[PDB]
Amino acid sequence: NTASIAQARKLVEQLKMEANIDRIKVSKAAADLMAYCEAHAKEDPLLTPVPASENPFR
Amino acid sequence: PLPSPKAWDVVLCISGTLVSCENALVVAIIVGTPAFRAPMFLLVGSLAVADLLAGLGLVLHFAAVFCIGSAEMSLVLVGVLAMAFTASIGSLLAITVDRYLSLYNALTYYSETTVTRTYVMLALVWGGALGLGLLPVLAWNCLDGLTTCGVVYPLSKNHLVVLAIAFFMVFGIMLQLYAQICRIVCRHAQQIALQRRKGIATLAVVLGAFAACWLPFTVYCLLGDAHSPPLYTYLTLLPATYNSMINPIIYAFRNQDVQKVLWA
Amino acid sequence: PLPSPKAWDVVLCISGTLVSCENALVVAIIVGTPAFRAPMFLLVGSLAVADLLAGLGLVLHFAAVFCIGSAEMSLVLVGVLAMAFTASIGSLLAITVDRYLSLYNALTYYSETTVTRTYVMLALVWGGALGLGLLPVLAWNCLDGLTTCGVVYPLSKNHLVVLAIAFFMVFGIMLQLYAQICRIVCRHAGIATLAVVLGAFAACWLPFTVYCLLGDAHSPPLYTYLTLLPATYNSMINPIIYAFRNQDVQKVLWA
Amino acid sequence: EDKAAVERSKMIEKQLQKDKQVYRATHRLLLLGAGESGKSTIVKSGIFETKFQVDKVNFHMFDVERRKWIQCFNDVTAIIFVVASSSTNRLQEALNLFKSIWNNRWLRTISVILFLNKQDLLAEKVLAEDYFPEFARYTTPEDATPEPGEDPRVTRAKYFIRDEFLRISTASGDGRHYCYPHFTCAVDTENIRRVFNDCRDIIQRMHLRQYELL
Amino acid sequence: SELDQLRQEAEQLKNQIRDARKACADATLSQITNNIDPVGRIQMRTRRTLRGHLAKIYAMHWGTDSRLLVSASQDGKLIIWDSYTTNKVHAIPLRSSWVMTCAYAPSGNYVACGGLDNICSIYNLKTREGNVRVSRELAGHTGYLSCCRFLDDNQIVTSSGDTTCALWDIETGQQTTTFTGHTGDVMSLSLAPDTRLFVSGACDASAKLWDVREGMCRQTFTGHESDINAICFFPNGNAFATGSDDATCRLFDLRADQELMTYSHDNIICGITSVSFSKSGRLLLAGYDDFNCNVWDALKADRAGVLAGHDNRVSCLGVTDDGMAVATGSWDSFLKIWN
Ligand SMILES: CC(C)Oc1cc(Cl)ccc1CNc1cc(-c2ccccc2)nc2ncnn12
């Protein structure tokens, strides 16, 4: 019973703590993701190939 | 003034071209990846190389007699054909022998011993082929007229006799090796069937193909002289070349490995 | 009386007579004891009998051709000589195979199938000897006209070439057995005696079979005699060192 | 200074080559013991390994819910599975474990070396079991090979407990791996030569099927 | 009231929790990101494919300079590579033979390992004599080590198949914390970009959040209906992507508290083994069991590439420190450095 009640109460605190969590809207999260992508869309050698001058992999 | 080719010569040339193409394809597949550096695959590659040499020599000889007017260079071509045929027989014997030291030393295979064995055996096979190809370009030639020519226009009698003897001895060795392999296969098949006969059909097919492809030439060469009807040589040599169209498929295509690469 | 024999025929007759005497004294010991039925015991009997027949036929042919007009009798006797010379070669392979199987199947060879194996080996050996030795009194024959027969008089070239091919094939089936024996001996667990046996066989019965492919006919009989001489030496030497070494023979003979 | 780096690389390469040459000499095996079926007697942190030898061919054996770490033994030569012959229906648990290990969907080139163990207890119990109704509807195999001093009931039980782990083994294997009963008891000393022969047999069978003969 | 009231209250709490979760979501990002340009084709190919391993490989961690690389296989061999000249600076012989994890220090000094040996041993590369010797053997778990990253030169988070996650120390060696709450096997853990958080994916069809300094779970991410095998953060420390065995990659956000986008196509029904974001956070790299190293578009949710070439199963994946390589390790003892 002690183990069962312990696990039950622990689940209780975990659930109540994770219930009262701010939920930011997806819209501005996607906006931030787009902003990061555009701000770092240029430093993407995997998407923008570069010549052998600065490509030691030859 | 050059001779007019006959139909049989055209048939021989086209068979040589087909053999050359098939063996070139097989060797290209084998050499395509460094991951096929295995003893059995190495021997298969050696067989393919020997057959490619045979086909290329045959086609070059045909093109150097009836199209490009000349005869002095054809002797080297016949020597190359002899070397290639001896190499092919030796390589087939090598493959058959290695097929038994892997079915009997199953607990010691994958070791430097196998590498040393295959290296030494391949070296001996190619040395013998080189010797037999060099012999017709040495003191024992019928061109000088101090010897008896045989059923082959530039060849002689002694060379054909020694070649036939060597081939017969190798045939005996191969017969014994299968016999042993058939014994082992029958034992395993019986053990499997204990807890309720395709293990011999392949051996019979392979042996019958090899016999029906090689034996007639030697058999009708031994009891013959340089006066037989011309068509006899072509009729007896056609199966010898045809053998190179059945060796590579059996020994490098029925395998489940190369088949996938071929499908690509 | 007309033939007026020469030295070589006398030497051949002497060799045949010694072979026959040795063979008789070796087969008498084996047959005296009725309890000999082991695979070796039955196997060596065929070799001894065939070699005895070879010697007896040689001596009888020499005596008959030079004492009476044994034309047809000489033909039949040469046929029997071929019979016996083929039997003495087709049987050694059988015993070598039996020894190899007994040495590899260390604890499984001993069973009922061994008797059937030996019987079938004997049947095959004698059947092959009959097939090869029947031709001289069969369709192929030099004494018919336009047959370009081989080295010796009543032997068609095709017949002897077929015999040579058959023997050369048998020289491979027996060549790898010696290598297999060496492999088994060196792995699981002697080489000199096997090597000596192989060398004796090859040296003393190869020369004749290679001296009919090269030559065709119309050659001096001197080479023929000098090339057929080693056959009698092999025929004599086989039983001397093959079966007259273990106690099996001396133990029975002494008592 | 790149020359020193290249020399070090070559030295490490040759050392690795030597280590690989040493490595590619021995075989590997796995022991899926039922838990108490004499895992200590058949031996003749968590991972425990043993290294015996037969005819100079050094082997390699090691012991271990189990739904995952089977992935690490995809190349073992064979599995030395050890059953207990005393049945309580724990024999059903062993059969279920064997069934799960059979249709693993990933181990399709592994053969099992069965070691039915503790036969003395089975003999004592049967002479002095019957839970499965299928036992009554059974007959001794026509090709039985009983050792001297055996009772018909004892042989029936022995060959019925071995007919449950093969009735499923040779059902779905596409001829790629097989089972090999080797009845033993706490009483034997040559089980080490029932492993060597079976390993040789498995490798020979694999090579034969690779050549496409049988 | 041994357990009744607690389960009923937990059930109603979860009910209102996911009520708010679905209510707090406007719509998926697909329509927001559909307007962006579909860059399309991706070009990659091998440069200096590395070979020399004796058995199949399981893990690899890129150094801090995008040059070094360490991998381990089932032969007790942990060796250091250099994907510029294919040399071998250091080779480490292990003790066990079934390692299943690898890691690299942030300073490039220490190297860890582990696997099915229930241990997280590490090795030092600053030996006076020049060789490599074993270090403090941090042990105490009850299962097989799955992944062990490096928070710092002194702290080493770990995992286990016994539902445990506890960081250790090198000075003495003690589990100062023990994160718990999963039910199955903790397959892998992704270390936060700022070293102030981490996530893990269990085998019970869930991958919950985890703190860094108090071991208090603070979110749930009920996802795939099957096992999980990989997880990795987003370069901005805001989202992570999770693999599975049902051939369905998907990305989860730390703000939506629910599923965001799926990457499932019915053409292949094999299993995944790894995931890795592109340096720009626009392409998702899969590790499909069919030997194909597929690449997906992070936002278009479309197959942006089919680059492949391996023969055995593909297990490892990742990206260099700064857009230098996409090294992929398979079971064929070959490390294929791709660019
Ligand atoms: C092709 C030729 C060179 O090989 C032979 C040579 C001889 Cl004098 C006699 C026979 C054979 C073929 N039989 C053979 C050879 C070998 C072998 C041993 C060492 C190196 C390579 C091969 N091993 C074997 N085991 C069972 N037969 N067998």
Ligand SMILES: CC(C)Oc1cc(Cl)ccc1CNc1cc(-c2ccccc2)nc2ncnn12
């Ligand atoms: C002398 C002649 C009959 O023997 C042979 C004939 C051929 Cl065509 C090929 C090879 C051999 C000798 N190898 C052989 C034969 C037999 C065997 C089987 C059935 C009946 C009698 C003998 N069993 C064997 N087991 C291992 N070798 N081996």
Ligand SMILES: CCCCCCCCCCCCO
């Ligand atoms: C003419 C002789 C042909 C010999 C073929 C070899 C036969 C092998 C039989 C093996 C039987 C095993 O039960």
